[PDB]
Design a protein around this ligand. Structure first.
Ligand SMILES: O=C(N[C@@H](CO)C(=O)O)c1cccc(O)c1O
Ligand SMILES: O=C(O)c1cccc(O)c1O
Ligand SMILES: O=C(O)c1cccc(O)c1O
Ligand code: NA
Length: 175
């Protein structure tokens, strides 16, 4: 059994105009996490992790997430293949992910040098998951940018306790 808030129609998820894939390269800090499978948990509040976007020759991203767990750095690697329009992506080598039938990425907004919002949607074991990452070039962002991320997360149907801001750490995500 699993109950999920439904994934929003793509109509409610903006696309960043004139997406410069080269300027989106590099390290982003996950300053905000929201989604139908994300839950606030004050026992072990979630530690901040980072995701690095590196373009290849074929303009796909090698996407490496690095995070700190069990006293070690875990490295989660996958490829984002360019999608229907610039700033939109799909997951490469989907068959290597057991249960995974669908994966969409959409860069909602960014200024490239400070902040970014990315929308993800996946269907795994037939369950439709979606999430929104508040990307920060640094570990801290303005309260306006954070409130806008709360604003946008709610516009897609998520309640407050499904919107989390991971606490900054220094292990692994530097550098
Ligand atoms: O909600 C997600 N994942 C949770 C459970 O699958 C998680 O926290 O791992 C989730 C949703 C869209 C895309 C993803 O990469 C993703 O991990
Ligand atoms: O499980 C996670 O926390 C996670 C981290 C980075 C990237 C992902 O897709 C994840 O599901
Ligand atoms: O949990 C996973 O293994 C997973 C698989 C495919 C894509 C993801 O984002 C994942 O977190
Ligand atoms: Na991420």
């Amino acid at each position: 059994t699993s109950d999920l808030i439904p994934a929003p129609p793509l109509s409610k998820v903006p696309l960043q105009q004139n997406f410069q894939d080269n300027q989106f390269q590099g390290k982003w800090y996950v300053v905000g996490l929201a989604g139908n499978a994300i839950l606030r948990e004050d026992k072990d509040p979630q530690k901040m992790y980072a995701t690095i976007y590196e373009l290849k020759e074929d303009k796909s991203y090698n996407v490496t997430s690095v995070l700190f767990r069990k006293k070690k750095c875990d490295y989660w690697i996958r490829t984002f293949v360019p999608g229907s329009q610039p700033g939109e992506f799909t997951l490469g080598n989907i068959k290597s992910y057991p249960g995974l039938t669908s994966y969409l990425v959409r860069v909602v907004s960014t200024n490239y040098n400070q902040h970014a919002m990315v929308f993800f949607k996946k269907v795994s074991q037939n369950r439709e998951y979606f999430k929104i990452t508040l990307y920060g070039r640094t570990k801290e962002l303005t309260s306006e940018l954070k409130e806008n991320f709360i604003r946008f997360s709610k516009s897609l149907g998520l309640p407050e306790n499904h919107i989390v801001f991971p606490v900054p750490i220094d292990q692994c995500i530097d550098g």
